[PDB]
Amino acid sequence: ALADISGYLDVLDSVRGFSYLENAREVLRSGEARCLGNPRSEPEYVKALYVIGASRIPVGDGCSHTLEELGVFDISVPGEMVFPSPLDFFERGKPTPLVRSRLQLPNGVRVWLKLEWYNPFSLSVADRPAVEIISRLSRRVEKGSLVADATSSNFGVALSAVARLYGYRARVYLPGAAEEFGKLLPRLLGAQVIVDPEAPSTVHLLPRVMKDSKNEGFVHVNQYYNDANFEAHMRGTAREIFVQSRRGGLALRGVAGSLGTSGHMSAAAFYLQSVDPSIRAVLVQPAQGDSIPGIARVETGMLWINMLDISYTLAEVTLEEAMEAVVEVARSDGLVIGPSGGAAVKALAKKAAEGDLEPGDYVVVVPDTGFKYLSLVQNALE
Ligand SMILES: Cc1ncc(COP(=O)(O)O)c(/C=N/[C@@H](COP(=O)(O)O)C(=O)O)c1O
């Protein structure tokens, strides 16, 4: 028997750990899940179902229900694209677009582009963690409290818009080298914003955010460590690849992406590799000395890409190379991607070049619009 999952979403404030994900891998790999006689005695299982994007849970004595029965494949989007609020537009106006590129890579490597700038608050992938974190937070923290964190840019914009739609106050902390939209947009959205000229990278800002949090009593929502960030991308970004690939007719053979916290490619890779372990995750290690805004090298410390059981390859990419690839997607497809997007296009293009990749469909996750990166656009043409 099928019942509604909303009711059982207290397991989000009770399950801790990753042992619950073993349940995910089996439900996904099997394509079904066993019915639960007592839904409250199985907090791990229930949580797993939510995290793969079920809307319902299977309840009863011995039965089982498919992914489609559970609602992994439910279409959310109103055909007409009419939404009674912005927050509901984020929720139900999904999946973000998967667009097949005219870009031609060798060895029959077919490039598809998941356009995460089609998120309403930050025009970036960072909306999805920011709604998931703040939504859970609304359960426990009182309204009018200040929530805060460090960001390269996207998440601080997403945090500020969403915090303020949930009644919470916002502080964002940015490194000096980040972009003007990040420093400016939160303020337009009513946050306080603090910029450290000395801080060369976002992870380096963390001690300052932690110190101030202890002194001031704001809630440091902490995207690097906060398990919702991984979980948002499991029920949203990753699940969508799973669904779209199937409904799209895609022979899905892999994913390509970029890493800051590692939330979204950890989630795409794990989800996808639960359904089918052969799927490569091609990931980008920005080259040494170069800065690509939004992302970093793994060995600067990342939670999920390390600890979860994820087969992934790295290709090195310079900024200059990430920018070359922006330029060529823009001449191929006429779509203008951000620097981190072109870094994952480039990184796939090399494994393709090398002959390390099977013939088939690859989905790249493009994290934001190039319209926010005019300087790096300009410099890449001169
Ligand atoms: C443009 C762009 N490209 C890639 C990423 C990487 O996504 P993640 O692995 O899910 O954090 C992000 C994620 N952004 C967050 C996290 O950045 P950080 O992890 O501190 O390097 C921010 O803006 O501060 C991004 O904005």
Side-chain angles (χ1 to χ4, degrees), residues 151-155 202 223-224 258 260-262 264 294-295 340 367-368:
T151 188
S152 56
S153 272
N154 285 318
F155 194 74
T202 135
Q223 61 167 329
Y224 294 98
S258 74
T261 72
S262 95
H264 77 259
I295 60 169
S340 52
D368 75 4

Side-chain angles (χ1 to χ4, degrees), residues 198-233:
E198 262 59 45
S201 71
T202 135
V203 296
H204 275 110
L205 297 157
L206 277 180
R208 171 71 204 287
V209 185
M210 290 175 158
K211 178 259 113 190
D212 282 4
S213 191
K214 274 298 227 199
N215 277 196
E216 298 186 62
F218 65 70
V219 183
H220 164 207
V221 314
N222 198 10
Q223 61 167 329
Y224 294 98
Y225 219 56
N226 190 323
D227 270 330
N229 172 355
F230 167 76
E231 290 158 10
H233 291 306

Side-chain angles (χ1 to χ4, degrees), residues 312-325:
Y312 72 89
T313 314
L314 308 131
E316 298 250 303
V317 178
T318 64
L319 175 62
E320 188 179 349
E321 280 172 323
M323 299 313 309
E324 285 155 55

Side-chain angles (χ1 to χ4, degrees), residues 266-281:
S266 307
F270 184 91
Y271 194 126
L272 288 171
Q273 292 171 0
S274 310
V275 172
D276 176 11
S278 17
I279 294 173
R280 312 297 299 286

Side-chain angles (χ1 to χ4, degrees), residues 69-337:
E69 284 169 346
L70 301 168
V72 178
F73 289 90
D74 272 28
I75 288 151
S76 61
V77 66
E80 64 274 4
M81 296 281 292
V82 177
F83 304 87
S85 69
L87 199 52
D88 171 71
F89 167 45
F90 171 87
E91 189 58 23
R92 288 194 317 141
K94 288 296 183 286
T96 62
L98 189 64
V99 176
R100 201 266 216 253
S101 174
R102 299 157 95 240
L103 231 295
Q104 272 275 119
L105 275 49
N107 307 310
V109 172
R110 295 200 285 280
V111 178
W112 290 80
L113 300 194
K114 186 164 188 50
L115 302 182
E116 294 297 315
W117 85 75
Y118 277 72
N119 276 281
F121 309 119
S122 69
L123 271 62
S124 86
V125 84
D127 272 32
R128 311 158 173 274
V131 161
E132 190 85 20
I133 284 157
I134 292 297
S135 174
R136 205 157 314 172
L137 187 156
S138 78
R139 211 131 174 172
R140 254 232 277 277
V141 185
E142 190 178 2
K143 291 190 179 197
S145 301
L146 182 50
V147 314
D149 195 349
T151 188
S152 56
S153 272
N154 285 318
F155 194 74
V157 174
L159 192 64
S160 311
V162 172
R164 210 187 135 73
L165 279 181
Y166 270 88
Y168 306 112
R169 274 171 179 116
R171 185 175 298 175
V172 160
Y173 291 70
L174 284 126
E179 279 69 59
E180 303 305 312
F181 78 93
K183 307 149 143 200
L184 189 53
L185 297 209
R187 294 212 299 112
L188 161 53
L189 300 159
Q192 303 165 355
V193 171
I194 304 297
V195 185
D196 212 319
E198 262 59 45
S201 71
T202 135
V203 296
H204 275 110
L205 297 157
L206 277 180
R208 171 71 204 287
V209 185
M210 290 175 158
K211 178 259 113 190
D212 282 4
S213 191
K214 274 298 227 199
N215 277 196
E216 298 186 62
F218 65 70
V219 183
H220 164 207
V221 314
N222 198 10
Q223 61 167 329
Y224 294 98
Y225 219 56
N226 190 323
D227 270 330
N229 172 355
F230 167 76
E231 290 158 10
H233 291 306
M234 281 294 295
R235 69 187 253 286
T237 305
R239 170 181 78 146
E240 292 169 37
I241 304 168
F242 173 49
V243 190
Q244 288 170 304
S245 286
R246 295 299 209 72
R247 297 233 157 87
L250 282 72
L252 181 63
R253 293 281 69 205
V255 284
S258 74
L259 314 164
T261 72
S262 95
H264 77 259
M265 296 308 288
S266 307
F270 184 91
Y271 194 126
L272 288 171
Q273 292 171 0
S274 310
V275 172
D276 176 11
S278 17
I279 294 173
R280 312 297 299 286
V282 179
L283 277 51
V284 184
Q285 270 262 114
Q288 211 165 19
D290 301 345
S291 301
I292 306 187
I295 60 169
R297 306 191 70 96
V298 170
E299 84 296 328
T300 63
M302 301 197 166
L303 174 45
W304 310 281
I305 188 58
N306 294 297
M307 299 209 200
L308 287 60
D309 214 297
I310 298 161
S311 300
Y312 72 89
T313 314
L314 308 131
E316 298 250 303
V317 178
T318 64
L319 175 62
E320 188 179 349
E321 280 172 323
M323 299 313 309
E324 285 155 55
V326 168
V327 176
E328 285 222 63
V329 156
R331 287 154 186 182
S332 166
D333 306 322
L335 311 160
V336 195
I337 73 179

